[PDB]
Design a protein around this ligand. Structure first.
Ligand SMILES: *[C@@H]1O[C@H](CO)[C@@H](O[C@@H]2O[C@H](CO)[C@@H](O[C@@H]3O[C@H](CO[C@H]4O[C@H](CO)[C@@H](O)[C@H](O[C@H]5O[C@H](CO)[C@@H](O)[C@H](O)[C@@H]5O[C@H]5O[C@H](CO)[C@@H](O)[C@H](O)[C@@H]5O)[C@@H]4O)[C@@H](O)[C@H](O[C@H]4O[C@H](CO)[C@@H](O)[C@H](O)[C@@H]4O)[C@@H]3O)[C@H](O)[C@H]2NC(C)=O)[C@H](O)[C@H]1NC(C)=O
Ligand SMILES: O=C(NC[C@@H]1[C@H]2CN(C(=O)OCc3cc(C(F)(F)F)cc(C(F)(F)F)c3)C[C@@H]12)c1ccc2[nH]nnc2c1
Ligand SMILES: *[C@@H]1O[C@H](CO)[C@@H](O[C@@H]2O[C@H](CO)[C@@H](O)[C@H](O)[C@H]2NC(C)=O)[C@H](O)[C@H]1NC(C)=O
Ligand SMILES: *[C@@H]1O[C@H](CO)[C@@H](O[C@@H]2O[C@H](CO)[C@@H](O)[C@H](O)[C@H]2NC(C)=O)[C@H](O)[C@H]1NC(C)=O
Ligand SMILES: [Ca+2]
Ligand SMILES: [Ca+2]
Ligand SMILES: [Cl-]
Ligand SMILES: [K+]
Ligand code: NA
Ligand SMILES: [Zn+2]
Ligand SMILES: [Zn+2]
Length: 778
């Protein structure tokens, strides 16, 4: 019980965290129904609005006023933000020319630039195109500071998963806020956005910025603002906190706006009604900057203007219903809308048939506006599976559409939540201040990367997260992180000819040019061999009986040759590797469901003599015939197409084992499938990393400057049910599938325990940016 009889006198928006039975005067007091009786009266003053007028200049202090225009307001830190403009003839911050902030210009007592995070809900990246005509303050921040054309949110592109990712540097599957609504089967409880359950600490994993700050002796302002607190009061509170004595003043602050999201949902992203909320957010930014200029902090503070996600045109007319595909939807609970998550209505109800449900949702309407996936089959780039709160059955919804349970379930013209690579879901990033670069444009980057940067801006050591520290050093003038190259754990063996062809009873019948960025380092304890060939180089695992990586270079005008008729089933023993550490063909003859493929393709052999190397047992990998349709098309058509378009390509391909879908390389005990009657593990995925020169006029094998990369993590599946057009020729569907499964080099590194690009002429920070790059095809 909380004693509301107490008073908020001289305690309004106190940073002093007090518990029961003492009444609170902070922002969260309303949500916990613990405010002192006089909180609204004393702390939420509204009298005379939020602006000084000429008639108010030099007034007598009236404590009932929302903000002040009296002579003592500056010394008291409670002037209306436009006080110096209206009463002292100063100019608005927006009307001043920007000047480079080479060093922080801070008043006495500030030893470090404070950080202000200005978060805007549903701020689509494209809204920035409106410019100074609609948003002059935001345009000045963007133009004069450091900005990205867009920032990639996390999936689902919903509010709480994205705001909490921004705060922690973690994927939702790791921080636990997997949706705006979620069901935890262990707690047997539902998290809702409009419930008291969301305040329970058990939902919130990882370590958010305000906790990282507090644990390291750095004071933080609130990261939660009550809906009942107007934006002008939020701004005045931040400014009042910035005016506090040296020993009370926070170093990190957060502002939040429910706009332009609110209006975006009502009118859609391209509605004329979108101008009004954009002008309003700009006015709030103007109040903050004028306020900072008033406190002599406008050239001292680092300001981050950031969004959680974008907004798409979504109407009630564009809704698919599960009742149109499934006989009985009454035994199912659906998390609906721009994504779908399906579970039984009764938590542990045994009448629930997941395989029959997926079958009825798979390619059952010609222009179907969603696709079902078992969570382990979702694109790996989404990192959306390793959490008990993520239902096994998922629906990836097409942009502009909704999924609902039945017709019983327009007032809305906009929505968000779709695949995080979707153009309309991209949001904003602007960094302004002494620590950010001046008038600099940076490439798009992911929001998971920001936590490390915010820790750098505050002199904090970041908690373990999913960002790649140093990948965003190019955004900063100072406070850059010096990254350390991961230490190589296992040393390779370099075997020569050690065995006879007669030593093998496998049932089988028959660096300068190819390793351009150095040997990938193996970052775990294992036994592996480096194998050299005329056309390729490989790192052959003696434990997994296959390469961890196969590396080769294809010139722009290289020839594609066929596999000769008599060499169709040709598999040759490798005299450098023991029969005991080799795969066997009897297993592929026995397994009626499993076939095999090759990592280096025989199609791209340099000569008929060289082609025989591609048929080595050490270049073979287990592949389902359905997957072979995809792999053969990539190997025979796409590798050469990419070489022709990019002026040669360097390709690194290999297997991935992720049976427990945690995005990390499996240990031997985690492998759950092997080739029939053998010890050959079955990969869950196959990766490829395709590098060339950013300057396409230079060939891939003779590149002087920055690199260009595209990568994939292809699901190794026994059917092509994911591709609704798979009955057609591979030219009509395989590339579409590969684009959906695009990946960062960093995603492959986590899944393999490998470290790429260790020997280049580029800085390590530039290589980290390259490794986090995602080719979206958007
Ligand atoms: C993204 O970046 C994150 C952060 O670095 C990575 O996630 C980490 O992965 C490691 C390795 O798998 C995990 O380490 C193991 O930790 C447990 C003990 O964990 C507890 O303490 C830590 C530290 O205080 C907490 O962070 C943990 O939090 C998890 O659980 C709570 C409570 O349920 C929840 O609120 C959190 O959201 C979070 O859940 C997520 O992670 C768990 C797995 O821990 C997962 O089940 C869940 O679905 C969520 O995804 C937790 O309270 C420890 O016992 C382990 O021991 C191992 O080593 C010993 C030997 O030393 C072995 O004997 C043993 O068998 C184990 O192998 C690990 O150390 C770490 O917890 C986890 N952190 C977070 C915040 O998720 C991701 O891997 C990165 N992703 C990618 C793709 O790179
Ligand atoms: O409920 C909705 N809004 C309510 C908002 C309260 C207050 N709030 C707040 O002040 O957030 C600031 C912040 C900033 C950061 C940052 F890191 F960026 F700085 C990190 C955090 C966090 F999460 F980590 F704590 C919080 C959030 C909820 C909503 C909105 C739109 C919708 N669309 N559809 N549904 C919807 C539902
Ligand atoms: C609840 O808060 C009120 C106000 O802080 C407390 O009232 C005070 O009680 C003491 C005696 O215990 C008096 O001497 C004070 O004069 C009271 N304050 C005022 C403003 O009149 C009250 O005791 C607190 N405790 C509970 C359980 O209600
Ligand atoms: C999957 O869809 C099929 C229709 O294609 C459903 O099968 C029908 O079920 C109704 C029950 O109301 C029967 O009257 C029909 O005879 C069935 N048709 C056929 C061709 O079998 C099936 O129930 C759906 N499955 C699920 C799990 O919803
Ligand atoms: Ca139907
Ligand atoms: Ca794994
Ligand atoms: Cl959700
Ligand atoms: K077979
Ligand atoms: Na198909
Ligand atoms: Zn949002
Ligand atoms: Zn929204």
């Amino acid at each position: 019980w909380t004693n509301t009889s107490g008073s908020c006198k001289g305690r309004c928006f106190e940073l002093q965290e007090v518990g029961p039975p003492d009444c609170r005067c902070d922002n969260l007091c309303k949500s916990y129904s613990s405010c002192c009786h006089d909180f609204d009266e004393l702390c939420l003053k509204t009298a005379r609005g939020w602006e000084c007028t000429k008639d108010r200049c030099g007034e007598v202090r009236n404590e009932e006023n929302a903000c002040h225009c009296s002579e003592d307001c500056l010394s008291r830190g409670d002037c209306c933000t436009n006080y110096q403009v209206v009463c002292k003839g100063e100019s608005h911050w927006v009307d001043d020319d920007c000047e480079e902030i080479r060093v922080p210009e801070c008043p006495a007592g500030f030893v470090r630039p404070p950080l202000i995070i200005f978060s805007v809900d549903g701020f689509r990246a494209s809204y920035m195109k409106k410019g100074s005509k609609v948003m002059p303050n935001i345009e000045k921040l963007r133009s004069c500071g450091t900005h990205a054309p867009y920032m990639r949110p996390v999936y689902p592109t919903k509010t709480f998963p994205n705001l909490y990712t921004l705060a922690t540097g973690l994927y939702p599957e790791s921080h636990g806020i997997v949706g705006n609504s979620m069901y935890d089967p262990v707690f047997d409880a539902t998290f809702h956005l409009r419930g008291r359950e969301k305040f329970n600490h058990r939902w919130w994993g990882g370590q958010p910025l305000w906790i990282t700050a507090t644990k390291q002796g750095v004071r933080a302002g609130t990261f939660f603002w009550s809906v009942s607190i107007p934006h002008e009061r939020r701004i005045l509170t931040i400014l009042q906190w910035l005016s506090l004595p040296d020993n009370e003043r926070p170093s990190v602050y957060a502002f939040y706006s429910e706009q332009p999201d609110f209006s975006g949902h009502k009118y859609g992203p391209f509605g004329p009604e979108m101008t009004n909320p954009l002008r309003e957010i700009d006015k709030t930014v103007g109040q903050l900057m004028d306020g900072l200029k008033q406190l002599k902090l406008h050239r001292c503070v680092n300001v981050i203007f950031v969004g959680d996600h974008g907004m798409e045109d979504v109407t009630c007319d564009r809704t698919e219903f599960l009742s149109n595909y499934l006989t009985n939807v009454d035994d199912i609970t659906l998390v609906p809308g721009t994504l779908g998550r399906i579970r039984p209505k009764i938590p542990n109800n045994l009448k629930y048939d997941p395989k029959a449900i997926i079958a009825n949702l798979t390619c059952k309407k010609p222009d179907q506006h969603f696709k079902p996936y078992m969570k382990q089959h979702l694109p790996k780039r989404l990192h959306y599976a390793n959490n008990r709160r993520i239902e096994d059955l998922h629906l990836l919804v097409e942009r502009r559409w909704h999924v609902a349970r039945k017709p019983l379930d327009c007032f809305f013209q906009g929505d968000h939540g779709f695949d995080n690579k979707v153009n309309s879901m991209q949001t904003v990033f602007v960094g302004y201040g002494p620590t950010f670069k001046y008038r600099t444009k940076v490439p798009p980057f992911e929001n998971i990367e920001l936590y490390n940067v915010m820790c750098d801006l505050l002199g904090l050591k970041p908690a373990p997260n999913n960002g790649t520290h140093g990948s965003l050093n190019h955004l900063l003038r100072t406070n850059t992180f010096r990254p350390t190259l991961p230490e190589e754990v296992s040393r390779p063996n370099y075997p020569g000819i050690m065995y006879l062809q007669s030593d093998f009873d496998l049932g089988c019948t028959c660096e300068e040019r190819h390793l351009l960025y150095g040997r990938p380092a193996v970052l775990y304890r294992t036994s592996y061999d480096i194998l050299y060939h005329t056309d390729f180089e490989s790192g052959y695992s003696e434990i997994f009986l296959m390469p961890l990586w196969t590396s080769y270079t294809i010139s722009k005008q290289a020839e594609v040759s066929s596999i000769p008729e008599h060499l169709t089933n040709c598999v040759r023993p490798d005299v450098r590797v023991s029969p005991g550490f080799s795969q066997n063909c009897l297993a592929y003859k026995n397994d009626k469901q499993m076939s095999y493929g090759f990592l280096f393709p025989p199609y791209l052999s340099s000569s008929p003599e060289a082609k025989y190397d591609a048929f080595l047992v050490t270049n073979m990998v287990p592949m389902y015939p359905a997957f072979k349709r995809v792999w053969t098309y990539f190997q025979r058509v796409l590798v050469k197409k990419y070489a022709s378009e990019r002026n040669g390509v360097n390709v690194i391909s290999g297997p991935i084992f992720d049976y427990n879908y945690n995005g990390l390389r499996d240990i031997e005990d985690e492998i759950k499938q092997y080739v029939e009657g053998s010890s050959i593990p079955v990969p869950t995925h196959y990766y490829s990393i395709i590098t060339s020169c950013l300057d396409f006029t230079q060939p891939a094998d003779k590149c002087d400057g920055p690199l260009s990369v595209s990568s994939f993590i292809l699901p190794h599946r026994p059917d092509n049910d994911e591709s609704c057009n798979s009955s057609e020729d591979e030219s009509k569907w395989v590339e579409e599938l590969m684009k959906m499964h695009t990946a960062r080099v960093r995603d492959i590194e986590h899944l393999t325990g490998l470290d790429f690009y260790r020997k280049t002429s580029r800085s390590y920070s530039e290589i980290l940016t390259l490794k986090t790059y995602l080719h979206t095809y958007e």
